[PDB]
Amino acid sequence: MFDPAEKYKMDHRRRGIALIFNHERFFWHLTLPERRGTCADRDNLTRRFSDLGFEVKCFNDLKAEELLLKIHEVSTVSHADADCFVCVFLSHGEGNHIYAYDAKIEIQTLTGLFKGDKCHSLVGKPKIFIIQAARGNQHTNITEVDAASVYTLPAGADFLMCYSVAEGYYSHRETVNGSWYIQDLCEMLGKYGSSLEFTELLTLVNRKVSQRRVDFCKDPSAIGKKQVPCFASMLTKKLHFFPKSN
Amino acid sequence: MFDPAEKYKMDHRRRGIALIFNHERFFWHLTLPERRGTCADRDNLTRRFSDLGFEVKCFNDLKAEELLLKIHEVSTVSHADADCFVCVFLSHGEGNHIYAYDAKIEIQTLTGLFKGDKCHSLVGKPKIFIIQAARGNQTNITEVDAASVYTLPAGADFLMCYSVAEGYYSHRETVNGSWYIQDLCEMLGKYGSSLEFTELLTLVNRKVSQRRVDFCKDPSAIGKKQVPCFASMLTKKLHFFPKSN
Ligand SMILES: Oc1cc(F)ccc1CNc1ncccc1-c1nnc[nH]1
C-alpha cells in the first residue's frame, strides 16, 4: 500500500488563502525602527502567491487585537474546498514572538489555530508559515542588517515553518528591493514555483541567500555578517503547486 | 549556469564518519531514568549507516569531558576525502542541552565544531545531526517522554533531525527502541541509497505521525501523538548512492 513518492492532494476547487501581515512602523513606546523595504516584500510575495492560485489577503500595521481577529476568522472559515494555507509575517521578532504594531504575540498561539485539533478543514493539508523577523537596530537603496532573533520553531503535523535567518546569522533588507530572503524566495517562486517540490525550492533559496557575498560592503561593520535561512518540515508528503486547470 | 537539481558531490574516496553517542544510564545525583531500548536504536542505526558506507563509531555512556574530547578529535581530523558527516545523540535533553552521563552540554557548542569557520575539510559538505532526546519521566513496554529539546537550527549545509516537536511526545519500546529511530532505520533500509535524504525524513514524519495512540496498554499514554521534524540549512539535494568499491 505505502508509497515513497506520495504527494499532498492539490486538486481541490481553490488553492487556498495566503495571509500576509506586513509591519513597517510600530507604536512609538516600543522603540523599534521602521522596516523600509517591507512593502517590496509584501508586493513581491502578493504577486508570486497570486500566480500560484492563492487568494492573497494583505494587512498593513495591524494592532494585536485586529491581527488575532483576522487570523482567528481565517482559522474558523471552512478550508474544505482548498489545497493548503499560507501565512506570512514581515515584522520584528524576539524568541517565540512576532511584533504587531502595539505588542508582541506568541507564534505558538498563531500556528495553534490551524493544529487540526482546532481546524478540521485543514487536517492532512499543508500549513506553510513564512517568517521574515529579526531584532530592531534601535539607533537611496541602503542595505540594513538585523541580528537573527526569532527561534526556528516547529509546529504540528503537516506544518512547514520557513525562516529568513538561523541563530548566529544576520538578516539583510535593501530599503527599496526588500529582504534578501524574500527577494530570493520570490525569484525562485517565479522560475520554479509551479514545477518544483516546495522544500526543493526552499533549499535553492538557502543556496542563493548563503552565497550572497558580505566581504566588500558600503558599511564597514556589515562585513562578515552571513545570512543562512532554514525551514522546519513537519510535512508528511511531497508538496507541489502545479497549475490548477482553468 | 545555476541549476535547480544540483546535488552535493558524493563521490569522495570515503562516505565519512557517523558518531553515535548512546546514553542508557546517568550519574545517580541527576535523577534521570534508564533509557531501556536505546541499545536497539544504537545497533539499528550502526547497521543502516554502515550499509551506506559510513565509518560508524559508537560511544556508550561517556562523561561530558570524554564526549567533548571524542567530538573535538573528529572535528580536527581532515574530512577532505569524505562526502559528509553524521552525529547522533541518544540521551535525555532539555532546551538547547543534551545529557552526557554526568552533565548537560550546549548543543550549539557540539554543532559549532563543524561550522565552516572551525572545520575547513567539511565546508560545502552536508553535516547531519540526529537527536533522540526528551525529558526523563521519573517484557517490551512502550515508555513515553514529553518533547523537551528545541528544534535548533545550525549553520550552512547542516541538517538537524529531531525525534519529536514542541507540544508532542517521544515513544521508546524497551526492546524494539524509539519510534523515531525504528521508522528512520526502516526507511534507511528500504530507500537510504535511492531517495534524497529529506524526502526520506518526510516519509519518517508520515510513518511516526500515523502511529496510533487511541487503544494503549497504559490509560494515560492515550492521545499523546508523536510528530518529528527536521531543520534543513542544506543548499543542494543529498543522496547516499552506493559507492563503487
Ligand atoms: O533558533 C534560534 C534562532 C535565534 F535567533 C536565536 C536562538 C535560537 C535557538 N532557540 C530555539 N530554537 C528553536 C526552538 C526553540 C528555541 C528556544 N530557545 N530558547 C527558548 N526556546
Swiss-Prot record, chain A:
Q: Where in the cell is it found?
A: Cytoplasm; Nucleus
Q: Which GO terms describe its cellular component?
A: cytoplasm; cytosol; nucleoplasm; nucleus
- Major enzyme class: hydrolase
Please list where the region (Tri-arginine exosite) is annotated.
13-15
Pfam families for this protein? Peptidase_C14
**Record-level Gene Ontology MF annotations:** cysteine-type endopeptidase activity; cysteine-type peptidase activity; identical protein binding
* Effect on the protein of changing residue 146 to A: Abolished processing and subsequent activation
Coiled-coil annotated residue ranges, if any:
none
Domain of life, per UniProt, equals Eukaryota
Q: What is the effect of changing residue 210 to A?
A: Abolished phosphorylation, leading to caspase-6 activation
Q: What does this protein do?
A: Cysteine protease that plays essential roles in programmed cell death, axonal degeneration, development and innate immunity. Acts as a non-canonical executioner caspase during apoptosis: localizes in the nucleus and cleaves the nuclear structural protein NUMA1 and lamin A/LMNA thereby inducing nuclear shrinkage and fragmentation. Lamin-A/LMNA cleavage is required for chromatin condensation and nuclear disassembly during apoptotic execution. (Microbial infection) Proteolytically cleaves the N protein of coronaviruses such as MERS-CoV and SARS-CoV. The cleavage of MERS-CoV N-protein leads to two fragments and modulates coronavirus replication by regulating IFN signaling. The two fragments produced by the cleavage interact with IRF3 inhibiting its nuclear translocation after activation and reduce the expression of IFNB and IFN-stimulated genes. The same mechanism seems to be used by other coronaviruses such as SARS-CoV and SARS-CoV-2 to enhance their replication.
Tell me how this protein assembles.
Answer: Heterotetramer that consists of two anti-parallel arranged heterodimers, each one formed by a 18 kDa (p18) and a 11 kDa (p11) subunits. Interacts with BIRC6/bruce. Interacts with RIPK3.
Protein's name in the database = Caspase-6
